[PDB]
């Protein structure tokens, strides 16, 4: 559409063009209503801009502002570009140059390299980085994984405090609560008993809502992590349920299951399952695999809990998931067996979006900062004819840059709580991701479920994982390995695919890298955790992350690629707009569309979730952490769902399921 250039040109007409001067204004800004001087730029970045303004102003190519779509730019304007008394002060390029400086500080070279690549749409950083980079309290991290400090009012309320402090800034929360005693449990020095997790959850629900103040963008939702042996498990998983008593729900928090392998076996073999209070059965969350199964079975023997039929729980879980899309599913044993952080202790949760897998304890709140590579941007014409090449060398090198960025962020970040700073300065985890897999397959003319798409997926993630580990090893040569590197799998030369007992695909030289790593270490304990990318991909104009498209339409967002093809066949007309709306966005079962187009523009409800699960399994061997595997069910059935779960579970997935999106 042409409405983009209209809006963009009109932003230009309402904004100063000299970057140094917009920085000046932003930095000099004063709250007229209050007389308070209210700077939107840090001292150190303001200075840097001033000490370099010529060099900075002239690197900006303001043309690049047009490389956004209408929906894209409006996303930028509505939430991203810094505002002055109600209206937009920053141009897109300003936002970008500002983010670039906030990341690189005095390294003007890097800053310019980041500006360039970002402005050309090669990658982007997560929302909190776009919001806060270069601003006075630069809270750039997206993820915090919080341990419930202790089963006491002090611990509970200390945790709640911490979560409010985190939520207030950017940053979602994954909070694990396995150590909280269940309903009916004994409390010393009183004859009343505990009312369990649900009342305590309602406290967190309430604080989640409170921390959301005005001009909306101080969000940071909560996901809560519970192992399914917890005695309060049946109420826990119903949190988002649409009905029942409004004093037992909690509609702003998300349930996530931290599932041991044992649970799944019990279900499969149609056996028993036992609920415990953490009090009556301590340590369950502080071991995994064999250790846990021994420990668990003993508590079972000792009569410490209440036994039910495993498939009772299972059935309930499926019903919650069907009706609400939750609880999420993440496999505790896959996460622990296959984590480079296993020298730290047992990992007890993932994050808000089920992609982060990092160690947390009461004094250590795991943090991650995220960025995503724009996959379609590495598509190239050959010595033409083809236009059917992916440039894996360019992708390798951008990943290298993004890795160096995410490292800078660790150091230039303002941490909302001391636990987060202690954690991140110690292990320095990082999280690279992607958007536009769907676009990329399409541009290369690959059906999502083809053997070419399957191969390209593998190669892509091999080069990102390789690139990041390489960039990271380089940093460890410059600055030393991260503090806890000694004793990790990676110190032993065990990398992620090794942990899946797989040879890597071999498009890159892993032995040399592995040699270098054992020699020099890595700067980062973890590097890859493909994430939802909701609004960042929207700004870039690409499909969410690594999923197929959900539609070829939307409101009247018509697939650029579909559309191109329809036209190249003339068959696209006016009674053509008519079909893709009347059917929710599918092209299958249309009378006059070439089979090849049908196969290429399969909608995610038309793709086999088995296919989906295989591809996630394929890429997972190169994924350090995990990834946000949404699952989509056509006409959901309890059996379809059970099969889908055990399939990913048996595939060794860490995150078996994020949202269940349905019908």
């Amino acid at each position: 559409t042409l409405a983009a250039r209209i809006a963009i040109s009109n932003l230009h007409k309402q904004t100063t063009k000299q970057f140094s001067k917009v920085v000046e204004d932003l930095y000099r800004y004063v709250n007229a209503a209050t007389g308070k001087p209210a700077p939107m730029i840090s001292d150190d970045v303001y200075n840097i801009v001033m000490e370099n303004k010529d060099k900075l102003n002239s690197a900006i190519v303001y043309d690049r502002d047009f490389q956004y779509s209408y929906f894209g730019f409006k996303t930028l304007e509505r939430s991203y570009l810094l505002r002055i008394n109600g209206q937009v002060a920053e141009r897109p390029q300003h936002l970008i140059m500002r983010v670039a400086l906030g990341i690189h500080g005095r390294d003007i070279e890097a800053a310019l390299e980041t500006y360039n690549l970002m402005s050309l749409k090669y990658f982007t950083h997560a929302s909190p980085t776009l919001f806060n980079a270069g601003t006075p309290k630069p809270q750039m991290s997206s993820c915090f994984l919080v341990a419930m400090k202790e089963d006491s009012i002090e611990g509970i309320y200390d945790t709640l405090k911490e979560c409010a402090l985190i939520s207030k800034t950017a940053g979602g929360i994954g909070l694990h609560i396995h150590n909280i005693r269940s309903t009916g449990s004994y409390i010393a020095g009183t004859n009343g008993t505990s009312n369990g997790l649900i009342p305590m959850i309602r406290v967190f629900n309430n604080t989640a809502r409170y921390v959301d103040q005005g001009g909306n963008k101080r969000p940071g939702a909560f996901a809560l992590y519970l192992e399914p042996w917890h005695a309060d498990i049946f109420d826990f998983i119903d949190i988002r349920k649409n009905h029942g008593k409004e004093e037992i729900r909690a509609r702003d928090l998300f349930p996530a299951l931290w599932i041991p392998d044992l649970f799944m076996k019990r279900v499969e073999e149609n056996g028993t399952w036992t609920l415990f209070s953490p009090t009556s059965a301590p340590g369950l969350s502080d071991c995994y695999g064999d250790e846990f199964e021994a420990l668990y079975t003993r508590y079972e023997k000792e009569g410490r809990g209440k036994t039910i039929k495993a498939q009772k729980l299972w059935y309930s879980i499926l019903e919650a998931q069907t009706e609400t899309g939750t609880p999420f599913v993440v496999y505790k044993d896959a996460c622990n067996r296959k984590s480079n952080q296993k020298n730290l202790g047992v990992i007890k949760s993932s994050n808000l979006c089920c992609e982060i897998v990092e160690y947390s304890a009461p004094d250590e709140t795991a943090v991650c900062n995220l960025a995503s590579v724009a996959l379609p941007a590495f598509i190239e014409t050959s010595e033409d004819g083809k236009t059917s090449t992916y440039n894996f060398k360019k992708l390798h090198e951008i990943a290298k840059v993004v890795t160096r960025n995410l490292n800078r962020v660790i150091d230039r970040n303002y941490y909302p709580v001391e636990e987060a700073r202690k954690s991140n300065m110690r292990h320095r985890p990082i999280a690279l991701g992607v958007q536009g897999l769907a676009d990329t397959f399409m541009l290369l003319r690959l059906p999502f479920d083809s053997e070419e798409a399957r191969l390209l997926n593998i190669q892509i993630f091999e080069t990102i994982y390789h690139a990041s580990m390489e960039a990271s090893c380089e940093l460890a040569q410059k600055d030393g390995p991260y503090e806890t590197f000694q004793g990790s799998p990676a110190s032993q030369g065990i990398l992620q695919f090794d942990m899946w007992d797989q040879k890597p695909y071999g498009m890159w030289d892993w032995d040399t890298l592995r040699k270098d790593i054992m020699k020099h270490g890595v700067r980062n304990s973890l590097t890859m955790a493909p994430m939802p990318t909701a609004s960042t991909s929207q700004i870039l104009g690409y499909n969410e992350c690594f999923e197929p498209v959900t539609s070829n339409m939307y409101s009247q967002v018509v697939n650029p690629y579909l559309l191109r093809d329809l036209v190249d066949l003339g068959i696209w007309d006016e009674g053509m707009k008519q079909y893709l709306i009347t059917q929710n966005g599918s092209i299958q079962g249309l009378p006059n569309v070439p089979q090849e187009l049908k196969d290429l523009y399969k909608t995610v409800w038309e793709i086999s979730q088995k296919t989906i699960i295989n591809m996630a399994a394929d890429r997972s061997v190169y994924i350090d952490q995990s990834h946000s595997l949404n699952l989509f069910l056509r006409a959901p059935t309890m059996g379809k769902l059970t099969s889908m779960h055990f399939y990913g579970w048996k595939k060794g997935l860490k995150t078996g399921m994020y949202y269940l999106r349905t019908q």
């Binding site: 299972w314 086999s608 059935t637 059996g639 379809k640 059970t642 055990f646 399939y647």
Partner: peptide
């Protein structure tokens, strides 16, 4: 309860 279904 089934693990063999079309999905």
């Amino acid at each position: 309860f089934t693990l063999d279904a079309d999905f």
